[PDB]
Amino acid sequence: GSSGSSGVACEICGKIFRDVYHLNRHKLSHSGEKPYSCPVCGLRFKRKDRMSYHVRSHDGSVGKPYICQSCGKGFSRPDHLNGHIKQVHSGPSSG
Numbered sequence: 001g002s003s004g005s006s007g008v009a010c011e012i013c014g015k016i017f018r019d020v021y022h023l024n025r026h027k028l029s030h031s032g033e034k035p036y037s038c039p040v041c042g043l044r045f046k047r048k049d050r051m052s053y054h055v056r057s058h059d060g061s062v063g064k065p066y067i068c069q070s071c072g073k074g075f076s077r078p079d080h081l082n083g084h085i086k087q088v089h090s091g092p093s094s095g
């Protein structure tokens with residue numbers, strides 16, 4: 001480095017500016033999530049082949065209202081979940 005001067009630091013990319021004015025015009029040039037950016041992370045991609053594997057990779061969704069406490073699948077109704085917990089899960093050494 002060897003460059004520890006007094007200035008500002010962009011809170012988007014991390015670029016340093018000798019003054020604030022030069023940074024004022026930069027913030028305006030910055031893009032707002034595009035063309036293909038992640039709604040979760042925030043990164044920006046210039047391809048649909050990447051963002052597609054990036055977004056899905058996270059899988060942001062719940063689906064059903066109630067979900068198991070183990071496999072966390074999801075059932076339309078509550079009673080349906082009660083039967084699963086006892087069907088698949090719930091099975092101690094004793095009985």
Ligand SMILES: [Zn+2]
Nearest residue numbers: 010012013014
């Ligand atoms: Zn910036």
Ligand SMILES: [Zn+2]
Nearest residue numbers: 038040041054
């Ligand atoms: Zn992401």
Ligand SMILES: [Zn+2]
Nearest residue numbers: 068070071072
């Ligand atoms: Zn389960």
